[PDB]
Amino acid sequence: RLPLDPTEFVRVLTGYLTGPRTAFHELVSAIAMVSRDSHDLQVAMDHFNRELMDGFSAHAAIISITQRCEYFRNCEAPTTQVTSKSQIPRAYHRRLRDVPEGPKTLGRGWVYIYLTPEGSLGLKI
CATH class of the missing domain: 1.10.8.950 (Filoviridae VP35, C-terminal inhibitory domain, helical subdomain)
Incomplete structure (x- = not known):
């Protein structure tokens, strides 16, 4: 198998x-x-x-x-890179929050840390 x-x-x-x-x-x-x-x-x-x-x-x-x-x-949420905020799915826009420093853990509900040219926006579950 x-x-x-x-x-x-x-x-x-x-x-x-x-x-x-x-x-x-x-x-x-x-x-x-x-x-x-x-x-x-x-x-x-x-x-x-x-x-x-x-x-x-x-x-x-x-x-x-x-x-x-x-x-x-205990895992760091993965990072995705996008050319702009606009390529992040639209329905996520209202839930995006700025991202702290340090452990952005999956256990604490993070899903994606988006990488945008002006900002690092996080999406939770």
Whole structure:
């Protein structure tokens, strides 16, 4: 069999989501981006399937990885670079906040630290 890579991880987990793309899709993508190898991805995936088995929704399970899986819990939120604020999805605009110094952890709910030419805007879950 084939161990996981980020792309398949994102496809499997976001399969359980519906509706327009929201910060939950981005949280899935952040979890995939921030893992160090296939082992972290299958930790996150095993936990996700555990939480669905327990009857949690996909959304709850996704947040539950950031809370209960110890690696992702203590992980710096990933950085995305954009040419401007305009290329950040529009629905996120109202929730963007400026970003502190130091640990912008996934456990504390961060998803993306966007990099813009004038500012470093953070998006929470």
